Design a protein around this ligand. Structure first.
Ligand SMILES: NC(=O)c1ccc[n+]([C@@H]2O[C@H](COP(=O)(O)O)[C@@H](O)[C@H]2O)c1
Ligand SMILES: NC(=O)c1ccc[n+]([C@@H]2O[C@H](COP(=O)(O)O)[C@@H](O)[C@H]2O)c1
Lengths: 486, 486
């Protein structure tokens, strides 16, 4: 409904005109307070708050509002500077951020150099946290300047809002920033600086943000060991298992800085954490996704989770996981969205009998082919070695699209299977080290007698014909990794 | 209707004969005024104006009119010179344009060196603006002479007509002139001289012309950064969102110099702006096309927009855009033409389910194949990897022409899709940097595991068989770009 937007925009235009007509500090402050009140009311509006606040932010984007606020932020009087930053913190949506990045970068960097004032420090922390979510080159230039060191410095204060903003900034730059940024931060010692925040006990939100930042940093293998040595990473898993997503979701809605929740593009960034191969990362990602699902289901906008790929990852995590806390979090999140909860698939595929194959077929939605699979007595050994011709002629999958879907399911089963009963040289982990999506080839190599001590003598033709590696890219990568003597 | 033409020609011939019989300044001026009054009466004629004035121009082209006017323009007396230039400004249609370029170029260049007179300067500005629309070699020779410097020099005056003519000339040379001319102008500092014109407030038409010129200059990436640093470019988008195309279209019709609008070849040059990849360029192009549509629909000549490819571009811009001002302008322009407005297509193709595919199929006009697609359960993942054989055998597109049409649609969907859920190494932007028509290949590479850090080791056979790049030209270009270490 745009009725709130239609009502609010006249008032916003009048306030902007008055601010443009403000020739002194008093009028400037009055106009800034008026516009801040107008935008805050929209940000706290139930259900339609985001759209009817992005509308006013877009309006301010036009009419020269952003440039006027920046110029006021350059004003000699700090009393106006603080209010200008206060308003600039609550408007930096993507459309209002790209302009600031093109124009307003640098001036804010220099302004951040005043590390003494508390209100200015808080507002500037807001600006930086909301700015680190721009393209990775913006992160490069921000870290090159004193922004990263500045937030590093503010980390040692006590007022809660500044610490929470610093933690949010650290998480945002850990996520959006590139691998170089994360390595740079680790060399900056930023991982160790978060330990007091995570171990603190004043607020649970600050601890959650610190754990998120440290986990996202730890996902990167290049610096995983030193990050773990900080000791804060081990504090992640115990924290999530105790907190309740509903209570954590009940919060973030009584507050104003997050009353409306998390956007579609900030949820896209968290989804990969469910695929991070790191237990703490998956746990914290599942916790955050559960909280955001709790918020959005109340907002009645759960469709976003489908467009992001979160439901698929949650179902896969439920199926192919052995831990308890992350499985429970994923199951609760799936139930919140009103989606089904897959039953766990026992991982020892090579030791599967007919019944297991029938159950798996019924799970993946190929129940039309249960009779054909049962007639031919396809078991785990015969399933892991199935081919296109055997699918087409013997099992009866004539349509090539259906066969592609079946192989798409079987590749996920292969990647997330357990080959302990087959490979005694632990060849699955070596393949997973290069790229996790190479773990599907374990059974291909193992059944041919290959081991870690025989790989360096293999050839591309043997991999193509005997081990059944079809894609040339994977063949070349495996050969290059093997010819370096494992 | 040629009745106006048939009436007008006898008078034009009598006036031309009288001018040829003019032996002094007074008779020359009288004949020039008569012919000027005649051509102007035709130019301001509703609906048929353009044709019945082009006929008078062809009449003048023959009978030695153009050579006579040029010789008068060489007359020692400036009183006759100004009128000769005044009449030469209003007759330079393409047929009358090429002749002057072959013959009358150079003399006009020298005459332009009279920077002091106001009337002569105005007429020369008109001549130069209407001449810069000749082949790019004519632009090269004009810039080599003092024409570009002369117009930049007149840009610093105040009389409105001269400034408007200079802005129009600069826009015309930016559009018709080659990339070398644009680079030359940027090095000439031509971008910066436009800032006062765009920031002016006396007339909105001058600001619009300056914004058009600067945007067309900025489309060229080689000089985009320095052009943006001028500061005028950022003033483009705020301007269009406030002006009304109808009022702007209502103007340019009360004026004689544009009473008839823009021609079929001056619109073909604006249409490429909708594909410029620059937000300001697309916004200004959409605004201009909307204004011209408003004019031509009143003239009842909207067919031209189909012959130019403007409707296809407008529909594509409406479908695959996220901005508000340009989308609104495109929708209004489409509605003026009496054409349909496509509903937006959500860009996250990889995350599509069956319903999204059915909607897309119904949009593109392949609703006859909805049942076949639904039966085979084609979704975004299977849609982005569809082939000729699967289309033919499994889905049932027997006619090769229909399959070519379908792939024509799918390639546009692929280029304008959002692969954020797939590519964490942001490989789409690298492909789009070489040529935007390569962004279609993103999902082809990504699904094979390739990244920016693995491209330099790929081979042509891998790009052909695995990544599915059929055209050899694109394969060679991609390999050459990758082997230079990204
Ligand atoms: N994301 C929210 O729930 C929320 C709530 C209230 C205000 N805001 C403001 O919105 C801006 C950030 O917008 P997005 O992060 O949604 O792009 C900031 O100025 C912030 O202060 C966001
Ligand atoms: N394009 C118009 O709407 C228009 C209107 C009146 C006169 N003219 C004259 O026609 C000539 C340009 O012709 P075209 O723009 O059709 O190529 C110039 O001499 C100009 O003064 C053009």
């Amino acid at each position: 409904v745009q009725d709130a937007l239609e009502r609010a925009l006249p008032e916003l235009q009048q306030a902007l005109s008055a601010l443009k007509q403000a020739g002194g500090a008093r009028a400037v402050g009055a106009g800034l307070a008026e516009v801040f009140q107008l935008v805050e009311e929209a940000w706290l509006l139930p259900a339609v708050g985001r759209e009817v606040a992005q509308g006013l932010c877009d309006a301010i984007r036009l009419d020269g509002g952003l440039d006027l606020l920046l110029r006021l932020l350059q004003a000699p009087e700090l009393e106006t500077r603080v209010q200008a930053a206060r308003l600039l913190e609550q408007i930096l949506v993507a459309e209002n951020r790209d302009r600031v990045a093109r124009i307003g970068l640098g001036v804010i960097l220099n302004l951040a150099k005043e590390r003494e004032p508390v209100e200015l420090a808080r507002s500037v922390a807001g600006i930086l946290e909301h700015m680190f979510k721009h393209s990775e080159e913006t992160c490069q230039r921000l870290v090159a300047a004193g922004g990263l060191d500045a937030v590093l410095y503010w980390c040692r204060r006590t007022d809660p809002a500044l610490l929470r903003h610093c933690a949010l900034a650290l998480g945002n730059c850990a996520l959006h920033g590139g691998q170089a940024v994360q390595r740079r931060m680790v060399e900056k010692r930023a991982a160790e600086w978060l330990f007091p925040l995570a171990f603190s006990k004043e607020d649970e939100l600050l601890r959650l943000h610190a754990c998120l930042a440290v986990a996202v940093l730890a996902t990167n293998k290049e610096v995983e060991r030193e990050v773990e040595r900080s000791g804060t990473l081990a504090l992640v898993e115990p924290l999530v298992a105790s907190l309740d997503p509903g209570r954590f979701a009940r919060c973030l809605v009584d507050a104003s800085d997050t009353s409306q929740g998390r956007g579609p593009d900030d949820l896209q960034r968290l989804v990969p954490l469910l695929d991070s191969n790191r237990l703490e990362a998956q746990c914290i990602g599942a916790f955050y996704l559960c909280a955001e699902a709790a918020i959005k289901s109340l907002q009645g906008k759960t469709k976003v989770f489908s467009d992001i790929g979160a439901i698929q990852s949650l179902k896969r995590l439920v199926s192919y996981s052995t831990n308890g806390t992350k499985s429970a979090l994923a199951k609760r999140a799936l139930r919140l969205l009103g989606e089904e909860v897959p039953r766990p698939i026992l991982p020892s595929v090579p030791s599967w009998k007919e019944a297991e194959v029938q159950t798996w077929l019924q799970q993946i939605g190929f129940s039309k082919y249960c009779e054909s699979f049962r007639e031919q007595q396809v078991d785990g050994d015969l399933l892991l070695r199935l081919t296109e011709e055997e699918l087409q002629t013997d099992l009866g999958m004539k349509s090539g699209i259906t066969r592609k879907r079946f192989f798409r399911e079987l590749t996920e089963l292969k990647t997330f299977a357990n080959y302990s009963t087959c490979d005694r040289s632990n060849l699955a982990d070596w393949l997973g080290s290069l790229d996790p999506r190479f773990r599907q080839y374990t059974y291909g190599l193992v059944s041919c007698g290959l081991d870690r001590s025989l790989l360096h003598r293999v050839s591309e033709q043997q991999l193509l014909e005997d081990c059944g590696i079809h894609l040339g890219v994977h063949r070349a990568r495996i050969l290059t990794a093997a010819r370096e003597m494992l």
